[PDB]
Ligand binder design. Structure first.
Ligand SMILES: C=C(C)CCOP(=O)(O)OP(=O)(O)O
Ligand SMILES: C=C(C)CCOP(=O)(O)OP(=O)(O)O
Lengths: 302, 306
């Protein structure tokens, strides 16, 4: 299945997920709603929620509570973006100025706490202690990972950073609809694998398909492959740039190093094998359009 | 009841609290690890987690999960403090304060859910959301001399009182106390939380004879500064109006203090706090007379004494 067939299949729900989000920017404190609208109305992508809504429909759910969990997951994602931009001192989040550049760090961090606690209130309103423990652990696991990276297998770094919230989204959505243990492990895995592939792609896309990863010598897979399989000269450069935590102005020779050792595609067929495990793990679920839709997002990812 | 006796009466539960704290802040990250020892070593009063354990025993709690509520309440306080350290382009550190604060907050939420009580999750969620809302309201009030005392009161209740209220109430909910008792604990937290912040705001201008002038220098309008402004002479009301708008007016502490003493702003605030404290003690009268209720009362007295 492809994009528009999914944008239309899931059109009604996602519209509700969208109203559910904006509905909670309720504060009497205007700065909260301002900064909120500013960041959630910048395009986004809505995959995590789309995965949430799909996971539910795929297991027979016919209610509208999956619309609320998908919405709170987006708020969570939103909150980590707000804090990440303050931490990474970013002034650009594709297109416009980050919330911090436009509102200030304080507001950005404080509004993200509002948004995160509100999502938490939304979960408690769902009354499932299991969804609460799964979700609270994933977010904490993310938070801890970010602290580690701050004071310093890179598949461990992205699992925590990205894959884990995907895992939670699909799984918790399943628990909420009242899925089966086999359907829960299935959905949970789809999320973990699609999340890993989502991130791998992302890192490979930072190298102009921006440029931030190298600028600060991030140990991404694309960069790590080039190092090992390139010339000792290209290899030395990449290595010191990482030890230096700075690869500014080293983009061209770096590319040449990749476009020669096939590091940029050795990374795509790494996310391609993760996207696979994802579609496989969905064997369990009942053959519904909702599933072939999930199967869709998997292929589209890479 | 004296502070010395309050500390001994709760020494055991506070050891339970510290244990809970170290178990949770235990991590290989090293930065989170250091934070554990620093908290359980603090020479501070640590009144918030203390109100949580006291609350539970006051209503007959015989288990020991009240110690976890005490621990998560201090994590919440600690987390809000870290985030309050974030500096704008008015430029530990931003990265550290934000990320460590995030680890702490998220861990408290984990601890909340471990208690297995949706009702407790209902009350804490709101509180942290309200604390967060109140923090942003305070951000907006910086350099604004025209906030009503309603706004200001909503601020102290929001950023301080609400946690005290939640601590007290959740311990009672956990102890399965009765509605009347819960509402009494609940109110006691609110009022004491309020008194606690009013004493704090006025002390920011005097006492001990960090340091006075901070709130003034930050252009942060607190009850006493606002009161002097609305009750002082026009010249004084203009200087205080300018000090809030411009900031960096720590050098105006003396003149401001004179404006305050002139209309009784400081005493007027202490008065209002002592009044909030009595109201907190009134709420507790609906609880069985016990040594723990005596301790809760002592804390209300100590919070406003001079
Ligand atoms: C690795 C992550 C967290 C960034 C990409 O995810 P998203 O595609 O969901 O980000 P946005 O669309 O919201 O900018
Ligand atoms: O890592 P980046 O700062 O590049 O992006 P996220 O952490 O928000 O995924």
């Amino acid at each position: 299945m492809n994009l528009e067939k999914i944008n239309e299949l899931t059109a009604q729900d996602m519209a509700g997920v969208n109203a559910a989000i904006l509905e909670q920017l309720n504060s009497d404190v205007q700065l909260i709603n301002q900064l909120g609208y500013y960041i959630v109305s910048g395009g986004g992508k809505r995959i995590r929620p789309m995965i949430a809504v799909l996971a539910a429909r795929a297991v027979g759910y016919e209610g509208n509570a999956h619309v609320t969990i998908a919405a709170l997951i987006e708020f969570i994602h939103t909150a980590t973006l707000l804090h990440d931009d303050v931490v990474d001192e970013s002034d650009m989040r594709r297109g416009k100025a980050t919330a911090n550049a436009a509102f200030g760090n304080a507001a950005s961090v404080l509004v993200g706490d509002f948004i995160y606690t509100r999502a938490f209130q939304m979960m408690t309103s769902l009354g499932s202690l299991k969804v609460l423990e799964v979700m609270s652990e994933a977010v904490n696991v993310i938070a801890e990972g970010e602290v580690l990276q701050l004071m310093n297998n890179y598949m461990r770094v992205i699992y925590s950073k990205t894959a884990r919230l995907f895992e939670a989204a699909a799984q918790c959505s399943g628990i909420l609809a009242g899925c089966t243990p086999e359907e829960e492990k299935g959905l949970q895995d789809y999320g973990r694998y699609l999340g890993t592939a989502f991130q791998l792609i992302d890192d490979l896309l930072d190298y102009n398909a921006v440029g931030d990863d190298l600028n600060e010598g991030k140990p991404t897979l694309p960069l790590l492959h080039a190092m090992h399989h390139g010339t000792p000269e290209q290899a030395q450069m990449i290595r010191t740039a990482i030890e230096q935590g700075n690869g500014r102005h080293l983009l061209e020779p770096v590319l040449e190093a990749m476009n020669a050792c096939g590091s940029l595609e050795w990374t795509r067929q790494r996310a391609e094998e993760e996207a696979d495990k994802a579609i496989a793990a969905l064997q369990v679920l009942p053959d519904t359009p909702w599933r072939e839709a999930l199967i869709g997002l998997a292929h589209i990812a890479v």
